[PDB]
Design a protein around this ligand. Structure first.
Ligand SMILES: O=C(O)C[C@H](NC(=O)CP(=O)(O)O)C(=O)O
Lengths: 311, 312, 311
């Protein structure tokens, strides 16, 4: 039976029941990945990757997912220089060409809106691996799955979203999906200059999600099941050096922060990180960001299976 | 069963009519394999090494897909100038001798004409020329002729328009060369005056029994042809005269008005990539064949890999 | 039983008995590679490559080795620009990410010491494919295998190491392995600016290996079993292109040099070469550098097999 989605492009394609069913499949994929026996679920299928921006986690997890299921991969790892995009070929022409060689396309473009255009052009499934600074739906899926896996529930949780909330596609998209669950509380922890935009705030309010803004990470972290960290780039302060200095050292996950957190809470980060999570934190079992990346393998295995062979 | 008569695929002149027709029959067999649900194991155990010194979408990915659709594997070198030890200064001959130690067939797109021939002479395994700088692109010519046969139903007795920079055009020259292997073919040359087809092709066509005609009226030509083969006007060929490039670029466009004069079962081809020389409108017409053409490259390259590695 | 090494990082990890046993495995891998049947020894296993500097032989021989054994490969063939290392990600974060997708990591880095750091971080085997101008243990293994194959002995051999010794991660690791044999003599022949570094000299002296510096390549070549030529390592000279050009052209293997060498002696070179072996040498049966590179396939097959499935 076919998967109801023809492409995986944006968070709004998913409802709670679909998320639960996908997560069920991802748990089965964990069993497959831990086995000694090579799976042949996707034997005979080919994935074409089209990476127009750099990637470590999303590119390698999709390729590993395909090969762990017995499929194969045709990679284009830097499309703007190594493909005929370098000769001016449009996205739509690239898609209509590559679909002749493959059964599914995984694309990370440089412009928001590209993934939807690719899906509309292609007659094979497309997965958005990051749409420039826009949607990154499989990151949001693996983030929610990781919370469920680590905490054991999604209803009734408290999540701190930390860092560049105004511009951060990962925190915005995670908030969007968490709103499909019940009794969720979200804390928006950031300097005022990069606070969460009103579109997400209004959506959470309409969805019955309680939310609170704070600039006090130490206070918030003691009350949360999940601290989900992102960086605030220096450039986001613009010429306001005063605000950069006022925020300095206040939005970092360090050993002192772990000291106020609950024993069963976790630290998440979509990666890559820089110094906004210190290396000491890594030694704590609650540091979940590498387990989170591994969960992307299982989620992407699930999606490849569903899009290519269905339920 | 017998050995393929070619040890390498380097240039159009290696092919005669009989060989072309036989390869096209193998390509039709490969289309049946590619459509099947069962994974082929014809090339299980064989390894292809790619060596791409210039960018590619169609040629690189179709060869890799062809190999994997037949059950073989691929070792890719996707930007050889930068990430291979050619970046350290290595000669082509040393690269080829090295890579043959790891692989069973080499597919190479170089930037210098004559590289493919030098690679075949060095290697003791088959080499396929995936484009040779200003030189030949033989598998493109094979897939072009195959596409005409598949779309029109015949090669003898067809009319083909070749459009663009004909003076420097690699694909139009090689297509003309192979079409001359068939009978009662007529070719129309449509180009800006500055980049007309060179005399070497004109004389070969007349010598080979192909009628040809130059025209500056694409609307008149297109109404009389089974195939309109469009190409991209490229800046590099105009040297330090950007003004001449811009003048040439606008002249011969395949647009809705041109499709409106074409025959009901004619086709538009283009080796790709295109810029604006085929408008987006044309894509909506069933006669726009350039994406089917690219797909046919998969079947042709499957056929060549099979023939070169395991024979007829 | 399990292989006694958990990673292949440094020449000093190998003792004489281990080298002889690895060479026996490599001979079995040669039989596999020459056979018409596809091996499935490593079916189900995935190798991740991480190449932060260019490579032809090391990269392709490892990938070919893995596929010839029936495994699969996830490539990052330009990690500095095409992975998230371009965004500042530390090596330790890259390793902990990639290990979630793979069973073994093969890494070439531009910084000496990187492979040992990776091994200390990863809970899967790591193979050093070259760590800056530091070491290159698998080149050293294939080099010693080649000497044994071509000369028929390692004890009592005389080896000339020629060219850029200072920066030559090849000759550094090779020196470490040659010291495991008896009655060896090594000649160092180089421009003064790139003479062998003191760490290697001190190690050979402490191991009882005779060594001698000389600037007379014709004299040295006439009395050696092996003349091991190298490329002047331009990428290690930084901005000192004056010193780079001064170091070239001083020591050339040409027909005149072969004319003074013994009939049983060989020329080796890890490759690529530029001008330092003339093309007319290639026709001489003693020119062993292409056989050497082929032997790398068998040695790397052996290491992948041993690290993943044991003896
Ligand atoms: O590059 C050299 O000159 C020697 C040595 N060469 C190799 O390992 C072969 P490659 O660089 O093609 O992998 C190296 O240290 O990288």
């Amino acid at each position: 039976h076919m998967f109801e989605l023809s492409d995986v492009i944006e968070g709004k394609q998913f409802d709670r029941e679909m998320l639960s069913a996908i997560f069920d499949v991802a748990r089965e994929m964990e069993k497959i990945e831990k086995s000694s026996s090579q799976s042949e679920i996707l034997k005979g299928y080919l994935m074409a990757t089209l990476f127009y921006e750099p990637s470590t986690r999303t590119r390698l997890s999709f390729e590993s997912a395909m090969k762990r299921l017995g499929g194969e991969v045709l990679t284009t790892e830097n499309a703007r220089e190594f493909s005929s995009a370098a000769k001016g070929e449009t996205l739509e022409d690239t898609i209509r060409t590559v679909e002749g060689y493959s059964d599914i396309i995984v694309m990370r473009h440089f412009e928001s809106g590209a993934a939807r255009k690719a899906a509309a052009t292609a007659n094979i499934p497309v997965i958005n691996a990051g749409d420039g600074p826009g949607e990154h739906p499989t990151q949001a899926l693996l983030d929610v799955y990781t919370i469920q896996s680590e905490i054991g529930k999604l209803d009734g949780i408290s999540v701190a979203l930390v860092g560049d909330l105004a511009n951060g596609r990962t925190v915005r998209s995670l908030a969007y999906l968490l709103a499909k669950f019940k009794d969720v509380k979200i804390y928006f922890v950031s300097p005022e200059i990069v606070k969460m935009k009103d579109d997400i705030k209004d959506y959470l309010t309409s969805s019955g999600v309680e939310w609170e803004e704070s600039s006090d990470l130490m206070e918030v972290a003691s009350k949360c099941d999940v601290v989900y960290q992102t960086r605030i780039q220096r450039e986001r302060f613009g010429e306001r050096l005063d605000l950069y200095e006022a925020a300095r050292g206040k939005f970092i996950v360090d050993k002192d922060l772990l000291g106020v957190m609950q024993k069963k809470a976790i630290i998440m980060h979509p990666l890559p990180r820089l110094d906004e999570i210190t290396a000491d934190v890594d030694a704590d079992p609650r540091a979940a960001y590498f387990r989170q990346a591994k969960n992307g393998l299982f989620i992407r295995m699930a999606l490849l299976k569903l899009l290519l062979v269905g339920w």
